[PDB]
């Protein structure tokens, strides 16, 4: 999981790596995402690929 | 960084967070990204130097 954000020019890049006993879809679990890195780029972004 | 003194009322400033009080070592545990603690009433209660 790679939650992203862009507030106050603080382009945060979260992450979380959790293995589960499922190979079909997202499970009925719950895992918080720690701010692995933070990128103070302060640019305007509106699209990605 | 000049000094660190404990158990006596001083003016502590950690990276920008300012405040007056006594610094007491505790057995609490943080997370690597987490910096300073907090109470149930928006009260600062711990700061990892």
């Amino acid at each position: 999981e790679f939650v992203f954000k862009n507030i106050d020019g603080y382009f945060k890049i979260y992450s979380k790596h959790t293995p589960i006993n499922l190979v079909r879809d997202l499970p009925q679990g719950f895992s918080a995402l720690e701010p692995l890195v933070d990128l103070p780029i302060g640019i305007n972004i509106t699209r990605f690929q | 960084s000049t000094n660190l003194v404990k158990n006596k009322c001083v003016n502590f400033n950690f990276n920008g967070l300012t405040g007056t009080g006594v610094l007491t070592e505790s057995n609490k545990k943080f997370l690597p990204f987490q910096q300073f603690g907090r109470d149930i009433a928006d009260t600062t209660d711990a700061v990892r130097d």
């Binding site: 997202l26 918080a32 995402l33 | -």
Partner: peptide, 17 residues
């Protein structure tokens, strides 16, 4: 094509402990 992200996207809003 679509699925249910049940309780996903709950991170730490701050480095405050």
């Amino acid at each position: 094509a679509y699925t249910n992200s049940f309780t996903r996207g709950v991170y730490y809003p701050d480095k405050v402990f």
